[PDB]
Structure formats: C-alpha cells, structure tokens
Design a protein around this ligand. Sequence first.
Ligand SMILES: *[C@@H]1O[C@H](CO)[C@@H](O)[C@H](O)[C@H]1NC(C)=O
Lengths: 48, 48
Amino acid sequence: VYDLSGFTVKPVATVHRRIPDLPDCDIDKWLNNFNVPSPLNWERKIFS
Amino acid sequence: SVGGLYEIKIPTNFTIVGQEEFIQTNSPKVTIDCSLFVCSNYAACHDL
Ligand SMILES: *[C@@H]1O[C@H](CO)[C@@H](O)[C@H](O)[C@H]1NC(C)=O
C-alpha cells in the first residue's frame, strides 16, 4: 500500500477585490516638477 | 515466641476486591506527508 504525494484541489475561478472609483496618484507629475530640491532639503509626498 | 508459639493475625472473614489496570498496546498511527507539510502547494518550495 503506497501513500501517494498529497494533491490539492486546483482553483476553478479567481476572486479579485479592490476599492473602485479611486483617483490616479499622479506620481509622475510630482516627480517631474521642475523645482527639484537638494539632498539637504529633500521633499516628501505621500500617495494614498 | 512464648513457649515456641508466635502471635499472628489470621483472617476470619474476607471479600473479593477488583482492581482494573489499563495497559497500552497500541497508539494512533501518525502518517506525515513530508512534501505537503514542508511545502503546501508552492512549486518554488517543492523545487528547493
Ligand atoms: C463477613 O462479612 C460480611 C460483610 O460485613 C458479613 O455479611 C458476614 O456475615 C461476615 N461473616 C462472618 C462469618 O463473619
């Protein structure tokens, strides 16, 4: 009697859930701003 | 011994007492799929 390697029931579908209607982060607009700071006064922006 | 006779307590009445004793002769037959235990179904883990 041979106990074979364990199998797992393969998925039949995929569930993808995200919050809808969120705005674009516009990260490139902030990174491409022409007023570039020096390392001494580095600027920060938070995207959420 | 007094006059070659010793004092001894001899029973005059009795009963039958029962004492149970469990002796383990078996145990649960644990089987482990080492592949499924170590790596659930992750191909990257089964490769390593
Ligand atoms: C023995 O002990 C039992 C229980 O106490 C009693 O019923 C019985 O009469 C006794 N017999 C004698 C001969 O002492």
